From Swiss-Prot:
UniProt GO MF annotations: RNA binding; structural constituent of ribosome
Pfam annotation, one family: Ribosomal_L7Ae
Native organism taxonomy: Archaea, Thermoproteota, Thermoprotei, Thermoproteales, Thermoproteaceae
Alphabetically ordered keywords of this record: Ribonucleoprotein, Ribosomal protein
Stated name of the protein: Large ribosomal subunit protein eL30
Cellular component terms per the entry's GO annotation: cytosolic large ribosomal subunit
PANTHER family (alphabetical): RIBOSOMAL PROTEIN L30
Stated family: Belongs to the eukaryotic ribosomal protein eL30 family.
Claim: Kinase is one of the keywords in the record: no
Record HAMAP family: Ribosomal_eL30 (MF_00481)
SUPFAM superfamilies reported in the protein's UniProt record: L30e-like (SSF55315)
UniProt GO BP: translation
Keyword Ribonucleoprotein: yes
RNA sequence: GCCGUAAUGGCGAGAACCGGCCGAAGGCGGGAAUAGCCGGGGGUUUCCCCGGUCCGCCCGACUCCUGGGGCCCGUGAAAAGG
């Protein structure tokens, strides 16, 4: 699976929440299906997402790139530490879960 | 894309924008006009009385405060006290 191509499909067809602060809110208040975290996320951010996603029962996929590379894989000109997939519109981004 | 600077620029690692919190030198009132000063008088040995002590602008530090940026094979004390 190409992570980037499927992420751009989930963004444009479904509902994708982009950014650490909004991802945390979705985990705490919403019901996201998958959370993706960049490999070079800071220790404080990784532990926060790991803890909240655990209590929320949401799987975490660690993107194999930096937050700069995750942003490029989402066709964004900015970093993305973490993003939450709430709706996989026409992609199979949920294939990353297993 | 959007927001900038004297200059460097800033943002999903959270921008613009809106509301708030902490927060200088110093300003202003009180001190305080009763003082001091200026002018006009009367005493005596330094005392008493009278009038004014205003309006509107500008420059402005080497003094005081604040923040930004840069440099170092150089990194710019310690303790009492609080
Ligand atoms: Mg200049």
């Amino acid at each position: 699976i190409d992570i980037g191509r499927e992420l751009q499909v989930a963004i444009n067809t479904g509902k994708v929440i982009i950014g650490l602060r909004e991802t945390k809110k979705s985990l705490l208040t919403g019901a996201p299906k998958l959370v993706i975290i960049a490999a070079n996320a800071p220790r404080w951010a990784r532990e926060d997402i790991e803890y909240y996603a655990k209590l929320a029962g949401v799987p975490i996929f660690t993107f194999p790139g930096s937050s700069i590379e995750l942003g490029a894989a989402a066709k964004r000109p900015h970093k993305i530490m973490a993003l939450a997939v709430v709706d996989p519109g026409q992609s199979e981004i949920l294939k990353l879960v297993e």
